[PDB]
Structure 1
């Protein structure tokens, strides 16, 4: 069994730099786990952000960036906007399945 963890919620403000972090229960997240980052907008709109641990999905704004930081993966926004306010999701490829984190609620004030 493999539980993925994300921060429940985090508060920021325009122009600020933010870091969301997807971690594992089994152990350090790697390139093997192919970290996916998805944003949930109201009315249930998922939009792909980060692919292959760190590939900006051909659509995500330049302010979105993925990478591994320590034993975990992370999504960072460099100069956040109001419209970045949403719940972000991360999935972890454990070889033959996919595990979703609980989502991070990001309030842009």
Structure 2
């Protein structure tokens, strides 16, 4: 088992040190520690291999070495472009084993209120005797968000499917939430609402079969 810390944060220009731990007890140079970076919307990329060897295009602010039986990845003067997930992999003579991954977050990106747009069921879907409500949330930072649905003024849990917030190409997050209903259920309420909670503030959007 390869153990990594869950999350680390730093400001731009700050320093961060990633720890990779082996449940067997110790990591040596014969475990060929490999550090893999994953940004959202970018492919995985191997930054460090065999404990300390850097990939040709990685900057030298990244370094890997072994400290006290643990493999370590240090970022000296971290950058906003370093906001990503970092995985550690160890070699045990015949195979690699990956760790759970450590999320590194670089502070400085300002807060962003979520933009919420709720779509009612189409006329084309209602004709096929199906009904789906689509709640689209975009352009919010940070990525923590809470989605609650309301039929009339009462909450709804059955039929709700929500995606995990993922980063767009402009570094802000986005999410979607679906409420599949029957056509009889859709016209039997005066309205339906998607309320989105972000940083203690709640944005509410409402649709109705009226329109």
Unaligned 5+ runs, structure 1: none
Q: Which residue of 2 aligns with 1:104?
A: 102
Q: State the 1:58 CA deviation.
A: 1.3
Instruction: Please report the TM-score for the alignment, with normalisation by the length of structure 1.
Output: 0.95
Runs of at least 4 residues off by over 6 Å: none
User: Are positions 1:62 and 2:33 aligned together?
Assistant: no
More helix by share: 2
Between Structure 1 and Structure 2, how many residues are aligned? 107
Q: State the 1:47 CA deviation.
A: 1.2
Q: State the 1:101 CA deviation.
A: 0.5
Q: State the 1:44 CA deviation.
A: 4.8
Q: State the 1:24 CA deviation.
A: 0.3
Larger Rg: 2
Instruction: Please report the TM-score for the alignment, with normalisation by the length of structure 2.
Output: 0.50
Contact 1:37 1:50 in 2 (8 A): yes
Superposed CA deviations along residues 52-105 of structure 1, whole A, max 9, x for unmatched, are: 101111111111100001010000000001110000011000110100010000
CA distance in 1, matches of 2:6, 2:79: 19
Q: State the 1:50 CA deviation.
A: 0.4
User: Are positions 1:92 and 2:100 aligned together?
Assistant: no
